[PDB]
């Protein structure tokens, strides 16, 4: 059984980072060297592991989280980062074991006229814990005027639209991201490299 990373990496649509998707990969064999060279990745940074060495290990579970952020925020997808994305949208733990993988998706996720359906959370009462999620679209009432679910004065929508256009500079173009994390438990599933 070959691990279905094609479904992850090549999904037509990607989650908003505030609603980042997670797929559990299990009971399969994957070649991570092949994966490393399967496409042109603008970043491919591993912590505690590396493709060539993954090819010789077995794990209980592999999780593939995926979403879209802008180019200059890929660097927030790392252990011990801060900023809007790391604080409020997608948080890796300090002791992360896995790989962060990104590539420019300007051709797929921009619109001439702007794509506002990719969003990120701009504020939150407190920072995300690692791998915590916050999908609330609820308007935040900052005064006594009820919002009844409508933006306006004292009524802040907590999600900001990226608004991706092809004309944007590289750092503001959309990037698709896949975070592979690797888990070993006393459990029966196994996800192995070709020589594990």
């Amino acid at each position: 059984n070959l691990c279905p990373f094609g479904e992850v990496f090549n999904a037509t649509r990607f989650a908003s980072v505030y609603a980042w998707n997670r797929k559990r990969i299990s009971n399969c064999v994957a070649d991570y060297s092949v994966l490393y060279n399967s496409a042109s990745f603008s970043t491919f940074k591993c912590y505690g592991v590396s493709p060539t060495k993954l090819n010789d290990l077995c794990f209980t579970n592999v999780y593939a989280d995926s979403f879209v952020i802008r180019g200059d925020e890929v660097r927030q997808i790392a252990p011990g980062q801060t900023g809007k994305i790391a604080d409020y949208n997608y948080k890796l733990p300090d002791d992360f074991t896995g790989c962060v993988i990104a590539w420019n998706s300007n051709n797929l996720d921009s619109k001439v006229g702007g794509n506002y359906n990719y969003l990120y959370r701009l504020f939150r009462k407190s920072n995300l814990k690692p791998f915590e999620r916050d999908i609330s679209t609820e308007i935040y009432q900052a005064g006594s005027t009820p919002c009844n679910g409508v933006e306006g004065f004292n009524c802040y929508f907590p999600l900001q639209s990226y608004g991706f256009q092809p004309t944007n500079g590289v750092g503001y173009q959309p990037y698709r991201v896949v975070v592979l994390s690797f888990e070993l438990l006393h459990a029966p599933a196994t996800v192995c490299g070709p020589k594990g």
Partner: peptide, 8 residues
């Protein structure tokens, strides 16, 4: 889904 702001 994933069309919170613009109709696609």
């Amino acid at each position: 889904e994933q069309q919170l702001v613009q109709a696609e």
